[PDB]
Write an enzyme that holds these catalytic residues in place. Sequence first.
Site, short mmCIF file in Angstrom:
data_model
loop_
_atom_site.label_atom_id
_atom_site.label_comp_id
_atom_site.label_asym_id
_atom_site.label_seq_id
_atom_site.Cartn_x
_atom_site.Cartn_y
_atom_site.Cartn_z
N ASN A 1 -6.48 -2.84 1.85
CA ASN A 1 -6.42 -4.26 2.17
C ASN A 1 -7.82 -4.85 2.23
O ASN A 1 -8.71 -4.27 2.86
CB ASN A 1 -5.71 -4.49 3.51
CG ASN A 1 -4.20 -4.54 3.37
OD1 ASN A 1 -3.69 -4.40 2.28
ND2 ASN A 1 -3.49 -4.77 4.48
N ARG B 1 0.84 -1.19 0.00
CA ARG B 1 0.00 0.00 0.00
C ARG B 1 0.89 1.26 0.00
O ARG B 1 0.60 2.24 -0.70
CB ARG B 1 -0.99 0.00 1.18
CG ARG B 1 -2.07 -1.07 1.10
CD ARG B 1 -2.93 -1.19 2.38
NE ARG B 1 -2.12 -1.59 3.51
CZ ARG B 1 -2.54 -1.76 4.77
NH1 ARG B 1 -3.80 -1.58 5.13
NH2 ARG B 1 -1.65 -2.12 5.70
#
Length: 90
Positions: free
Chosen positions: A37, A19
């Site tokens: 996520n 990320r």
Amino acid sequence: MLKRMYARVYGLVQGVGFRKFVQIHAIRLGIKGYAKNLPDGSVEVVAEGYEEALSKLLERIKQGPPAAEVEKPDYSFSEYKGEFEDFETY
């Protein structure tokens, strides 16, 4: 020439800096949206910007950070909305 990119990234993509990697490359490329996520172990990415910049981000996504082991991403383009002001992670 503006689009929204949806992409779902599969493989070993959680616990590996993914990320942060996406956000960093998005910021460099002037792209807004988010990386998120998902409960199944995959990652969701929503990105808005110039088609050319989104295409470069998708290539980075396919590679991932050093520890990631990315399996073929699903993606699709749709209409640019301008609902995002930056690039966030969740």
